[PDB]
Ligand SMILES: Cc1cccc2c(=O)[nH]c(CCC(=O)Nc3ccc(C(=O)Nc4cccc5cccnc45)cc3)nc12
């Protein structure tokens with residue numbers, strides 16, 4: 220029951236998402252083995268997701284978390300990359316498909332940095348890469364990330380479910396020497412995929 224709203228490149232909504240996409244790119248210390256080598260993206264499409272039923276599922280849970288956290292939902296816009304993006308925009312987020320082998324338990328992981336979620340679009344650690352060329356650093360095939368609303372509530376700083384009294388877990392693991400933040404929820408209701416971003420990484424040369 221979802222419909223997608225095509226945003227024009229000359230739109231403030233489009234540009235803020237585009238900006239947050241480009242500005243949050245980091246220089247991963249794994250030589251781009253996971254997500255590929257790039258500085259910026261070639262942003263092809265940014266579609267806003269509309270689903271009243273899933274939005275009501277979210278705002279309902281958001282209110283519940285606010286009450287449990289001194290009326291502070293701790294709402295944040297975060298990126299999510301996975302091969303199941305197109306399933307999520309219709310069925311919503313679902314903890315029953317959570318990353319079981321995750322560092323912070325079976326949950327739904329997000330990131331501050333767009334480039335960090337990019338490492339998970341084709342699978343954990345990039346998987347085998349794109350379906351056609353089997354290249355984790357493919358500059359041809361289009362990729363898709365979600366730019367979601369995320370109710371963190373009272374987040375627990377660590378280093379399955381949420382620890383007691385909390386609603387999410389915030390980490391900052393140092394992969395290959397660089398520390399970047401992570402965010403995990405253990406209930407799909409605490410996230411709404413607001414924007415679907417179709418893009419591709421640019422060959423830096
Ligand atoms: C470890 C880490 C750090 C920072 C960012 C990420 C990230 O963006 N993605 C990932 C991948 C892990 C992850 O969140 N996986 C994942 C979590 C949730 C879902 C999900 O909600 N899937 C689904 C939701 C609804 C229906 C589905 C039907 C079939 C299959 N999946 C469905 C699918 C995949 N990991 C990150």
Ligand SMILES: [Zn+2]
Nearest residue numbers: 349352357360
């Ligand atoms: Zn490819």
